[PDB]
Amino acid sequence: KNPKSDKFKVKRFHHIEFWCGDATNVARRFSWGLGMRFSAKSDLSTGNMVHASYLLTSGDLRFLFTAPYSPSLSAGEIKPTTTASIPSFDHGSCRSFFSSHGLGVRAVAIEVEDAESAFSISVANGAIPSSPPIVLNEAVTIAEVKLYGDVVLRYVSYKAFLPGFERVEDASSFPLDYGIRRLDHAVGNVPELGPALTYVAGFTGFHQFAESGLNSAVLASNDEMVLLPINEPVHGTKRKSQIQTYLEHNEGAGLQHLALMSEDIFRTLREMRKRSSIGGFDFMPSPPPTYYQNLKKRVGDVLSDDQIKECEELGILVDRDDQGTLLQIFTKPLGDRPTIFIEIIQRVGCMMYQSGGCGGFGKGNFSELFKSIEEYEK
Amino acid sequence: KNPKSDKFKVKRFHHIEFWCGDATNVARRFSWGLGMRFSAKSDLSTGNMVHASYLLTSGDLRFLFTAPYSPSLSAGEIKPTTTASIPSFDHGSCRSFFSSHGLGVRAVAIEVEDAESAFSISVANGAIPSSPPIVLNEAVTIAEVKLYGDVVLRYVSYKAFLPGFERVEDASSFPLDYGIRRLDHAVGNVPELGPALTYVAGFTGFHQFAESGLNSAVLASNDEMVLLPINEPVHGTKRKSQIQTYLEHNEGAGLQHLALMSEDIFRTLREMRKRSSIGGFDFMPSPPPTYYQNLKKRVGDVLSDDQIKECEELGILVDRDDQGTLLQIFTKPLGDRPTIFIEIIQRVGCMMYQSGGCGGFGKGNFSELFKSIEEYEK
Ligand SMILES: CCC[S@@](=O)c1c(C(F)(F)F)ccc(C(=O)Nc2nnc(C)o2)c1F
Ligand SMILES: CCC[S@@](=O)c1c(C(F)(F)F)ccc(C(=O)Nc2nnc(C)o2)c1F
Ligand SMILES: [Co+2]
Numbered sequence: 107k108n109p110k111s112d113k114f115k116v117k118r119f120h121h122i123e124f125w126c127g128d129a130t131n132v133a134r135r136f137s138w139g140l141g142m143r144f145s146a147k148s149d150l151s152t153g154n155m156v157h158a159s160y161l162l163t164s165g166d167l168r169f170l171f172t173a174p175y176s177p178s179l180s181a182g183e184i185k186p187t188t189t190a191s192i193p194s195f196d197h198g199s200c201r202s203f204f205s206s207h208g209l210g211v212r213a214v215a216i217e218v219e220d221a222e223s224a225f226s227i228s229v230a231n232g233a234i235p236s237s238p239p240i241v242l243n244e245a246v247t248i249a250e251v252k253l254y255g256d257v258v259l260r261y262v263s264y265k266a267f268l269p270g271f272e273r274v275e276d277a278s279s280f281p282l283d284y285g286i287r288r289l290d291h292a293v294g295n296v297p298e299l300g301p302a303l304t305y306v307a308g309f310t311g312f313h314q315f316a317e318s319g320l321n322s323a324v325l326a327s328n329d330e331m332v333l334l335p336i337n338e339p340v341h342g343t344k345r346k347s348q349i350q351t352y353l354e355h356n357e358g359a360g361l362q363h364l365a366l367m368s369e370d371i372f373r374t375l376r377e378m379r380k381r382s383s384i385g386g387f388d389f390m391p392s393p394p395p396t397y398y399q400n401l402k403k404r405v406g407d408v409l410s411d412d413q414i415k416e417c418e419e420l421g422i423l424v425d426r427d428d429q430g431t432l433l434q435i436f437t438k439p440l441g442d443r444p445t446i447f448i449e450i451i452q453r454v455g456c457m458m459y460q461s462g463g464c465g466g467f468g469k470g471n472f473s474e475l476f477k478s479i480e481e482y483e484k
Numbered sequence: 485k486n487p488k489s490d491k492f493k494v495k496r497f498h499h500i501e502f503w504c505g506d507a508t509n510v511a512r513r514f515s516w517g518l519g520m521r522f523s524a525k526s527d528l529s530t531g532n533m534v535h536a537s538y539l540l541t542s543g544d545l546r547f548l549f550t551a552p553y554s555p556s557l558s559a560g561e562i563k564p565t566t567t568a569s570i571p572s573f574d575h576g577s578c579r580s581f582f583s584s585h586g587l588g589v590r591a592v593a594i595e596v597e598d599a600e601s602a603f604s605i606s607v608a609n610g611a612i613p614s615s616p617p618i619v620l621n622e623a624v625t626i627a628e629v630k631l632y633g634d635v636v637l638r639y640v641s642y643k644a645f646l647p648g649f650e651r652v653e654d655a656s657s658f659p660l661d662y663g664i665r666r667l668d669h670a671v672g673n674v675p676e677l678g679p680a681l682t683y684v685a686g687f688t689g690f691h692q693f694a695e696s697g698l699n700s701a702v703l704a705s706n707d708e709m710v711l712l713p714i715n716e717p718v719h720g721t722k723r724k725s726q727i728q729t730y731l732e733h734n735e736g737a738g739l740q741h742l743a744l745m746s747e748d749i750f751r752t753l754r755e756m757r758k759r760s761s762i763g764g765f766d767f768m769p770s771p772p773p774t775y776y777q778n779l780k781k782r783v784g785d786v787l788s789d790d791q792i793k794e795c796e797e798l799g800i801l802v803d804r805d806d807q808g809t810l811l812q813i814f815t816k817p818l819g820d821r822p823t824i825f826i827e828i829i830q831r832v833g834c835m836m837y838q839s840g841g842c843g844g845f846g847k848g849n850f851s852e853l854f855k856s857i858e859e860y861e862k
């Protein structure tokens with residue numbers, strides 16, 4: 107059931123912002139590793155004396171990487187005279203975030219009809235304010251509220267990337283593309299799922315979409331294209347909860363993984379794996395061949411034996427709903443700490459356009475992986 | 485003249501350590517961009533709860549990238565019980581360095597005969613101590629003194645990379661190589677050259693090796709293989725001193741550039757330029773064709789017309805001593821700030837092995853570049 111109780115009009119995921127120590131090196135690494143174009147910049151060369159911000163795009167997916175300059179460069183500025191292109195930015199908040207959490211996601215940004223309204227209604231409904239609505243060049247409105255930990259949910263609305271960003275000069279912009287097209291979901295880890303759900307569902311109106319080490323639940327907008335899973339750990343097992351491991355290494359709640367939809371997960375994974383050891387991303391260990399011997403009995407009617415064999419060479423996981431089928435794979439952590447990672451996903455089914463969440467999120471793969479592991483010991 | 489006044493026995497440049505916010509992403513970017521292998525690691529997977537350190541190598545060139553974990557992971561440790569593989573490391577010093585300077589070089593490390601002795605003699609001769617001699621696994625001794633700004637000169641000596649580092653698993657270690665072989669020199673920028681020279685020459689015994697915006701001087705070890713240029717700005721010009729621009733953006737003195745010797749600067753630059761826009765390094769703008777039309781009259785006896793044309797397609801600079809000839813080129817800044825950059829260099833002449841500094845450091849290229857610029861306006 108979908109009660110469609112959004113308290114404001116939400117469109118789609120708009121971008122994800124990483125707070126970095128050096129935005130240049132993270133952005134260049136992510137560009138090569140994921141096949142994302144350099145699309146826009148805001149830095150010293152555009153008059154920004156506050157922060158260096160670089161935007162990567164792939165289809166509708168937008169990754170923003172931001173780091174602070176020396177405060178001395180903008181010491182004479184005040185907020186009314188700021189050269190920062192993102193007015194919520196703050197040297198102290200950014201340095202504190204990164205020193206506390208390491209590299210990771212500061213902002214999950216969704217495009218809304220009216221960011222000022224979305225902010226007001228959110229706050230009137232319990233949201234903790236983080237940065238008030240600010241109108242940029244009479245064209246774009248941006249506002250922020252707290253989501254969990256030091257992660258903010260950012261509202262952006264357009265009358266018509268951001269004012270103050272310049273499009274990147276073609277020579278600097280190499281048209282890489284490995285098939286990734288949009289953000290499918292963004293998953294938070296928190297110490298207690300209950301109050302996190304109540305808080306976020308409280309101020310958005312998002313509805314519940316619906317051995318492990320976790321409990322979770324998914325909040326979703328009216329059309330279920332903005333999907334916001336939240337995990338909590340389950341304590342006292344045999345293998346320690348990776349949710350609890352995250353909270354310890356991350357110094358508290360934060361974003362656990364971004365799942366990126368590919369229009370062709372086989373080409374994406376071929377392209378990403380060729381680059382794993384030459385600056386790109388590493389993938390988690392492949393499941394045993396028992397896992398793939400068991401795929402015929404589960405998805406033999408959705409995927410041919412050749413497509414199943416192709417999942418096997420690439421290390422791809424498969425799970426299935428009552429409504430659809432899902433291909434997924436997981437990278438190793440994106441940075442030094444065992445915290446944030448990326449998932450590549452592709453959904454087959456639920457044609458009407460494709461409805462969101464088609465096939466679920468792979469929860470069946472926990473049981474399926476364990477049961478392939480001990481039966482591969484054989 | 486070379487008075488050979490080293491106060492302790494110095495062998496060679498041993499490594500360069502970058503202090504980072506996230507060591508993983510900087511190291512992976514540098515690996516792809518410069519063609520350096522992943523060679524060794526010390527992090528959580530090796531029992532290091534203090535810092536993440538990754539070593540890249542190319543020939544004798546060793547780049548170390550280090551970032552701090554959350555202090556909470558090692559809160560119960562004391563220095564006698566530390567899991568850090570580099571005992572001089574300190575969370576607070578590292579966070580402070582990076583937040584003040586951004587990405588850059590913390591340590592210029594030279595291999596010496598006896599790091600304890602080198603430390604004692606250095607300190608007895610005016611060096612400001614930074615980290616005392618520490619013996620690692622009865623095998624390697626490491627010690628540090630202040631060089632300029634927050635950069636340390638690090639002494640390492642071996643009885644026989646470091647204890648506690650593990651060699652990197654072959655699958656993770658892709659044998660990239662674009663021809664770079666060793667560190668040729670490491671250049672500091674300071675506000676006042678005089679006291680910096682006197683200080684460093686004071687405690688090492690290093691001798692002076694011998695429009696711009698700078699004044700400089702080069703300190704060198706007995707065999708002139710450790711070359712340590714230092715710049716100061718020249719104030720009140722027309723173009724503002726790039727040395728002064730460095731000090732402002734770097735928040736004070738620091739390392740300006742590392743010059744990396746290539747055994748084949750043409751292949752290196754071909755390989756580096758193919759990767760500039762796909763995660764690698766950008767190069768400064770090429771000199772005008774007038775610069776290359778003037779190369780025949782200057783180096784026509786060292787380089788053929790085809791080799792000169794090859795310098796022209798790649799953007800390579802050429803200068804010449806009385807003793808030798810030098811090919812050089814400069815990258816754009818390595819990170820967000822207009823501070824540290826890299827130089828690729830290759831020397832022809834001075835055969836005895838090649839003597840250090842053969843051909844100089846390209847000081848003639850300042851005059852030659854200006855004079856090609858206005859004559860290219862033509
Ligand atoms: C160690 C890294 C892999 S992991 O822990 C993992 C597995 C498996 F690998 F266990 F199969 C299967 C599915 C997911 C996932 O994306 N869940 C998820 N997303 N959104 C919701 C809601 O729920 C996942 F994170
Ligand atoms: C804007 C970046 C290029 S720059 O300022 C530059 C040029 C030129 F580009 F002006 F020719 C020529 C030579 C050098 C150099 O390496 N000097 C240098 N090394 N060691 C010593 C001593 O002295 C240099 F840094
Ligand atoms: Co997921």
Ligand SMILES: [Co+2]
Nearest residue numbers: 671743827845
């Ligand atoms: Co140089």
